[PDB]
Each structure stands twice: as structure tokens, then as C-alpha cells.
Symmetry: D4
Subunit: 150 residues, 8 copies
């Protein structure tokens, strides 16, 4: 990629439905070239897709959690435990980390009860889990993972 | 919203450039109605936008961190500290949480040095910060915040 | 329930033996209506009972503890462990919680020895327990769980 | 008090509206004597009152928390901080404790937002507070503080 | 015991070889009575013995430790683990405690190597031990366990 | 000192009132020599005194604590803080330690209230104190600091 | 550098006084070329020097510590605090780290007293220090920082 | 050793290739005597070798870690676990320590991936490991283990 590709990506990361004519006018390059560049970025795996940003609040997803997981160590436990956590409905983020915990899990649910049934009751049965500590999110100050270029 | 709106959203959350004809064929409703429903969802704030999912690895964003923040308590410190953390380049997530820490921050950088200059050196000067503990992400097992409907 | 039911409950939560005539005079409604409303609240399960508030100090209950419990995780451990903790004489509160511990237990005893025999020696034998940490209450500043309406 | 007083209290602690005739029949003593004994227990401060046990769930009190507080030490900080915590609407229990924290606070609210406005935003402004850690109650297994005699 | 017994004990707790004539002169009571009182205190188990206070430094006991022990819970583990810890040469204090640890052990050795061989290597083999954390004493500010009356 | 001095000390550390004739018979040395050796040990500071071992339980000292102290760092804080802690009535041991805490304090009181007034309320006013964590002793398995030679 | 430079370095990292003839014979290259390559590595800063590995035990350096430091945050505190720690006699390693602590310090002393005077008493006066936790090394299993190529 | 040996060592610890003539001129002793003294120090094991100080950065060793290890206790676990940790490529320091952890491990790798494959994936399979916490080094302020004489 080059300087122009980054400028294109900087626009698409926050507004993917901005018309080709509008993008071409902003960056200052031929539309045909813009189309070619975007197709290449998709072909090369830089742009992996396009998603609609849906307001979780509109779906009543008010029970937001960040759970730290301590594992029972064993050969390749990170693979086994990581994948089991990733399969839980409501879990959108699973990170293998360095520190006093081994995994950080990001999840969303509508209520305390849903969270207990879909998440807590599933996690407690995973053999690779020693224990977990869930941090309830009182307020989301910022959640814009789509912004990769500042 | 109704059952049909959810099915539309379930598709748009992972593939927003799927054609109207294809979406209409999958859900089984008139294209004109589909267009109307989508426009209403955007007008009502359910769909807040459309973004291109860019592979962070393609931008060499290999230094991924999850930082826990302990604050110096004071009136409305959550607002003041939260906003200062949110303004840091590279920070995409800022959560006010319950537990032994007060904020959880998600950030991405290309290198250790960039992380130190843009993030660590900025955070250490924020008066509302007591201290922080950064968890380095060794491997991202899953990061699909776009999926709001399972 | 309505606004009037709440006012009635606000009185009964701290003084259940206040006469019907006195309550009717305070809220300003017919005694017959007050009686009907109270009976309905009991029938609907809002008022689950009436208790005498006994001063624990009068019973020499001077050894007051708040114990945090870390569990050995397993399928439905919260049910099994929670119920075993709830059965211990002297234990009045058992809460399944989010955080670095899994249960918080509230108990009262007359002495250190009674606490050790009835509580500590029982808890240490429960297989679902990894370990516990007991916080001794030096002084109860406030303990009015009966107040549900502020 | 004597053996008979304890038996009377054991009944009143869970059912204070049980008729005098019924209580007298259960314990086996004259009604006049029972009335005298109860009046004496009230006069002596053993029975401090009578309350209606209201189901918190009926009032939508679904946000239940147990907050640990670390104080900024100073002369008589336990008195000053304890009283400020006790004054917060929704807080029913405040305990000065031994251990890694100095106070344990029990509170109830209807929602996350109410909890943030009435509790979190008030606590963060108290000068005697170093920091706090809130444990969200996922499920109340038992909460019968009225039972003082097992 | 009475006021006079306490005054006698207050003297014997720090100087047991003070002559009977000197003690009688200080407290103001007949020597025969003083002798009788002391014999009674010994007979009743108040005075369990008389020891020479030996300066540990004179024996090169420079490796002073305070070890916290986390146990593997089980029926009567406090008895079993407590006794095994008490049998270790060099260990003079073993306390069953409330908090994040279960036992506190006080020990003294001449060197790091002696401490490792006699204490660490013995403790690591005790099945009731989950783990321990040893706090090395850099300086003893005060160690006068003989003073029971201030 | 020599081998004989150690054997003498091994006896005096647990029974200082054992007669000279009995000690001489046990160790096998002339009484005159034994007396000379003991006087020399006292003169050289090896034997710093003789105390009566008083059973704390006989004095109702049932509230036994081991308190960890975190200090506010500053020049020679260990001297200043250590001495202030050592002056508190009821405190018999004060140790400057390595680890997550800076001092370990051993104290004894008759009741919870005495402990709060004499110890807690005094410690909270010491400026060099950041905070403390008190571990209540449920049972003393062993407390024989007089034994220096095993 | 190339494959040959690495082989040369792999030898020099553990035996720098191995003769040129011996090194040339082992790697299989002309001595003149070996000399040229080594001089270039020194000129380019790859080889920063040559040191004698002295056995710390021979210097009675028996008090080995690894100290974790929590800082008082502020602008560029890592620079200021890091440099002050690095200036302390006996300190050979100072690392700015991610996690619950901010610096890890490696030091060596002959005795507990030397450690207290040269290290502890100096660190406690540094304003940028919140507190520290020192881990005493009981046994060095391995300490070969000179090995950079495995 | 004597005063002169220490002065010789103080020079060799940072510059082992300083010529004999230069060292003799600095310390003020005959070259023949200097040679004899150095040979004796090597023969006596004081000087265990001579190494080239290679700049780790020149080898792209940018992933620097300090890992704390909690062990599963058992007979001689320190020997077994210590040796297994010492065998891992990239690990240069292994210390058996006192405190909340049992071992501190110092290691170096070129990248996050290398660190995960060579270190993390190996450590997680060691049966004697309960868990670990890795502290990533953001900046090395000082790393001069060769300096044994200050
Ligand atoms: N999985 C491992 O090998 C160790 C992970 C652990 N969280 C650490 O930081 O060391
Ligand atoms: N900001 C506050 O009032 C408290 C926040 C803190 N993290 C807690 O869980 O209690
Ligand atoms: N039981 C579970 O699944 C987890 C409970 C744990 N206390 C937490 O907060 O995550
Ligand atoms: N307030 C105090 O003096 C100390 C209280 C502290 N929680 C402790 O356990 O020691
Ligand atoms: N042994 C037990 O039952 C619990 C002991 C633990 N240290 C506590 O404080 O709760
Ligand atoms: N006083 C100091 O300098 C440090 C003491 C601290 N407890 C430690 O272990 O490092
Ligand atoms: N200095 C900083 O900004 C933070 C350092 C802290 N140790 C962390 O891991 O976050
Ligand atoms: N290995 C042991 O016996 C105990 C080691 C532990 N790290 C401690 O400090 O006590
Ligand atoms: Mg998206
Ligand atoms: Mg009640
Ligand atoms: Mg004694
Ligand atoms: Mg070297």
C-alpha cells in the first residue's frame, strides 16, 4: 500500500457508504483508479469486509462485561480455552494476555439473568478455567474499534 | 423494530455490501420494503453507520494492549479521566468499570516505542490517574464487536 | 401498585404495628381501603411477612463476619456451593457475586470459638470451596435491610 | 431474659403477626404472661421494632451491590467516612471491617444508571475515600437478616 | 486474681529474678503473703513457667522470617497443617488466621541456607500447603511477647 | 560461648528456676563453674533477663491480632513509623519487613472494643501510615518465642 | 552481519579469551578475516566490550534481591525515577515494565544491613516512589545474561 | 584476596582487554605480579571466565520479559521447576524467590511470536507450574550485571 491507500482507508473506516464520486473528490484521484485501488485492497485482504454499525443500546444490550480469566495450565491450553470462550453467544472479544490473568473476554447481554445463563453458567463448566473475575461496564466512554488509522 | 428488522440487521452486521436483491431473496420480502425498513433503521438511530473492516495486521498494528486504570477519586472523575483517555491516539475503547480498577482501555500501536510515546507517556501525565496496569495481548482469538445479534 | 401503595409500604417497612387508624390518618385514605390495599399487597407477594427487629447485641452476637469465598469451578457450582453455605447456622446472607471472589457470606456468632466450630470448621470441609477470606466487623455503622424505599 | 423469652423471640423473628393465642398455644404459657414478656422485651430494647418484609424484586430493585471501600486514613476517619456512606440513598448496610478494605457497603437500586447517579457519583466525591471496588450480586441465595436465633 | 496479683505479675513479666524482699518492698505486702500469692498463681496456671530471655543475635539468628500460608482446604485442615508447621525446627509461632491467608508462621535461622533446608524444603512437601509467601524481617523494632500487662 | 554454654542456655530458655544443683547434675559440671558461666552469659549480654511466662488467656487477652502496615514512604520512615507503632499499648511485636507491606505488628487485647480504641483509633492517626490490614488470630497453635535453641 | 558473524559471536559470548587460532580453526575461516570481522563488530557497536565474569559469591554478595517499584505518576516519571534507581550502589538492573508495578530492580549486597543502608534507606527517600516490594533470592538457578545467542 | 586483587577485579569487570601494561600502570604494581595475581584469581574460581558484551538490540532482541512463576508445591519442586525453566532457549535468569511468587525468570526474544512459541508454549506444559505473570520490559534503564564491585 501507499499514502493514497491509507487516505482511502481512513475514509472507509468510518463511512463505507460515502459515494465513489465523493471519495474521489476528497482525495483527488480518478474514480476508476479509486475503484481499482479499493478492489485491490479487498483482494489483498486489507479490507476484510463491510459492516453496519448497530447501536447495541437499540437492542437493549445493557449488560456489558469485561471478564478476566485465570486458566488451569496445560499443553496448548490457550488454544483450547480460547476457542471455547469464543464460542459463547454474546462474546465478541477473546484475548490471550500477559499478566495476572490469561484471557480477557468482552461480552454483551440484555440482562443480568441472560448473562448468568448464557455466559456464567457456561464458563463455570469449562475444565480449562481455574476462575474468572467479571468487571461490569457502568458506562462506555468510547467503543470505536473500527478506527485503525488515527 | 420487529422480527424482520432483526433478520435484516443480522445480515448487515457482517456483510453490509450484500446487494438489496440478494438480501430480499434471503429474507423473503419486497426490495422496496427492504429499502424502506433500512432507511427507517438509519433514521431511528439503530444503524449508526457503515464501516470497512480493516485488518489491523495489514497496518502493522502488532502492539495490542488492554490497560486497567486506577483513578485518583474526586467529583466527576469518571467524566474527566474517561474523556482524557478517549482522546489518546490509538485508543479505541474506554470503559468505566466496577471492580479493583476504574477504567479499562483498549489500544493498538505498531511498536513498543510508539506505544510508549503515544500512550504511556501521555497517561502518566494525567492528574486523575493513580496508576495503570497494562496487559499485552499475545494473540487475538476473537475480535468481532460488529456482531450484536447472535 | 400505585403511589398510595408505596406510601403505605414506606410506613410498614419501619413500623408494622402502627395502627390502621394512625396509618389512615397519615396517608389520608379510608381505613377499609387501607386494609384492602394491605391484604392485596400480601396476596400479591409484595409483603412477604412481618418480623420483629431483634437487637443482635441483646443476644450477645458480637462476632460479626463478612466472608468472601473463592470456589472450585464446575457445572452449577453456584447452586451447590450457595446452598451449602446457606445451610450453616448463623449465616443470614449468601450472595453469588462478580469479581475476584464468587460468594459473599454474612454471618453472626456470639464468640470466636462458636464462629470457628459452627462456621470455619464447616466451610473448610465443603468440596466446592477453594478458599475463603473473612472480614471481621469491628463496628456496624448501619444495618437496616428492612428499608427498601428511601 | 430466659429460655421462654428466647422461644418467643424465635417465633417473632419470622412471624410477628402470629396471634397471641396462637403463640401462647405453641409455647405453652398464659396469654397474659406472654403479653407481659413481650412488652418487657420491647421496654428493655431487645425488640427494637416490627417491620414488614417487602420483596425488593417487587420494587424492581434488581441492581444489588456489595462495595468494598479503601479509606484515606486520618483521625477518626471511620466515624466520618462511615456516616457519609450511611447517608447515601439506597445504602442499607455499612460495616467498618478488618482486612484489605476498611468498609463494606450493601446497597440496592433499580438500574445501572440509578446506581451510578445515586451511589457512584456520590462516593467518588467523599474526601475520605481512597477508592472502592464494587461486587455486583448476580443472585441472592439467601438474605434473612431477621433470623437472629437459629 | 485481684489488683495485687496483677501488680505482682506486672513485675514478674519483665524481671522474674527480682528478690522476694525487693518485690514485697515495691508492692507493700508481707513476704509470706507474696510467696503464697505467687505459688497460687503458678498452681492455678496463670504463671506457666519462668524463662531466660536469650538474645537471638548472640546465637547468630539473623535470618528472621514471617511466613503467610495458604492451605488446601479440607476437613480439620487447620489442625493437621497447624501441627505440621509447629513441628519444624526454628518455628516458634504458628497462628491460624482470618484473611487472605490461613496461617502466619514466625521462625528464626542463622542463614539463608539453613532457612532453605530446615524450613522451605520441609514446608514445600506438606500436602496441606497450597503455597506460602515469606516476609523477611529487615529489622526487629520490638519483640517483647513477655509483656502481657501494659 | 562453647558447647557447654549452649546446653546451659537450652535449659534456661524453658525453665529458668531449675535449681543450680539440678542443672549441674544434668549437664555434668561443677556448680561453681555453672554459676560462673551463667554470670558471664549475663554480663556478656547473651542472657538479657528472666521473665515469668504468663498465660494471656488468664488475663482474658482473647483478641489477638497480626496487622500488616503499608507506609507512606519518606526519609527514615521505618524509624519514625516503627517507633510510633511500638509505643501503642498492647503491641508486643513490630517488624520492618520486605514484601507488599512494610511492617508487621503483633498485638493483644481483651475485646474488640479495646482493640478499636487502643489500637485502631491510634494507628489511623499516624501520618506515616498509608493503610493497614489486620489478621485476627482464631487460634494460637504455637507461641514459644523463648525457644531460641532447637 | 551474516551467518559467520553469528558463529563468532556465539563463541565470544561465553569465552572471549579463546585464541584467534583456535576460533579460526573452529569456525573454518582465515585468521586475518576473523580479526577483520571482530574489529568490524566492535566498530559497529555489536560488541560493546569484554568483561571478566566474577563470581559474586567470591565477594560475599549473598544478599540478592529483585525489587518491584510502584511509582507516583507524573510527567516523565519513568525517566526521573529510573535514573535515580540506577544510581544506587549495588543496583545492576533497572527495568521499566508493564503490569501492576512500574520498575523491576536487580541488586546485590553482602548483608542485610548493607542492603538496608545502601538500598532501602535510599529508595524510601525518592519522591517518585509510592512503595516497593522486595523479593529475596534464596537461590540463583541461572544467571547468564552474557548468552544472547542460544 | 586483598585490596590489590579488588582493584584489579574492578578494572576487569568492565574492560577485560585492557593491556597488562596499562593495568599495571593504573594500579602501580609489577606486570609479572599482576599476571600472577590474575592467574591465581582464575585458578581460585574468582574469575570464572571472560565474555564479550554483545548488544542485544543488535540481534533484534526487542521482546524482553520478566516472568513471575507460581509453582504447584511438592517435594523439591524448586529444583525440578527451576531446572526446567533454565533449559528454555532465551531464558538467561532463573531465581528462586521469597514472596507471592516462587520464581522470577528473565528472558529475551526477537518477537511476540517467538516469545509465544519458545517460552509461553513451553512453560504452560510444565506440570510444576500453577501459573505465571509476565512483565514486558518497555525500556531497559540499566543492565550491567558484570559490575560486582561498586
Ligand atoms: N500461558 C503462559 O505461558 C503464561 C500466561 C500468563 N498470563 C503470563 O503473563 O505469563
Ligand atoms: N467510581 C466509583 O465510585 C467506584 C468505582 C470502582 N471501580 C468500584 O467498582 O466501586
Ligand atoms: N461463576 C462464574 O462463571 C464467574 C464468577 C466470578 N466471580 C466472576 O466475576 O466472573
Ligand atoms: N482503621 C484502622 O486502623 C485499620 C483498618 C484496616 N481495615 C485493618 O484491618 O487494619
Ligand atoms: N479455614 C477457614 O474456614 C477459612 C480461613 C480463612 N483464612 C478465612 O479468613 O476465612
Ligand atoms: N522501605 C523500603 O525501602 C522498601 C520496603 C518494602 N516493604 C520492600 O519490601 O521493598
Ligand atoms: N507508566 C505508565 O504509563 C504505565 C505503566 C504501568 N506499569 C502499566 O503497565 O500500565
Ligand atoms: N518454596 C517454599 O517453601 C516457599 C516459597 C515462597 N515463595 C515463600 O516466599 O514462602
Ligand atoms: Mg464493524
Ligand atoms: Mg425484618
Ligand atoms: Mg519468655
Ligand atoms: Mg558478561
Amino acid at each position: 500500500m501507499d499514502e493514497i491507500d491509507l487516505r482511502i482507508l481512513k475514509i472507509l473506516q468510518y463511512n463505507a457508504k460515502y459515494s465513489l464520486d465523493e471519495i474521489a473528490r476528497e482525495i483527488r484521484i480518478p474514480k476508476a483508479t479509486l475503484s481499482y485501488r479499493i478492489k485491490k485492497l479487498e483482494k489483498d485482504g486489507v479490507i476484510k469486509g463491510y459492516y453496519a454499525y448497530i447501536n447495541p443500546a437499540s437492542l437493549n444490550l445493557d449488560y456489558i462485561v469485561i471478564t478476566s480469566v485465570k486458566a488451569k495450565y496445560g499443553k496448548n491450553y490457550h488454544v483450547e480455552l480460547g476457542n471455547k470462550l469464543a464460542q459463547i453467544p454474546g462474546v465478541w472479544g477473546v484475548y490471550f494476555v500477559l499478566g495476572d490473568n490469561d484471557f480477557i473476554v468482552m461480552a454483551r447481554y440484555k440482562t443480568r439473568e441472560e448473562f448468568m445463563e448464557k455466559f456464567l453458567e457456561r464458563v463455570m463448566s469449562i475444565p480449562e478455567v481455574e476462575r474468572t473475575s467479571t468487571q461490569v461496564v457502568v458506562k462506555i466512554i468510547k467503543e470505536s474499534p473500527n478506527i485503525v488509522i488515527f
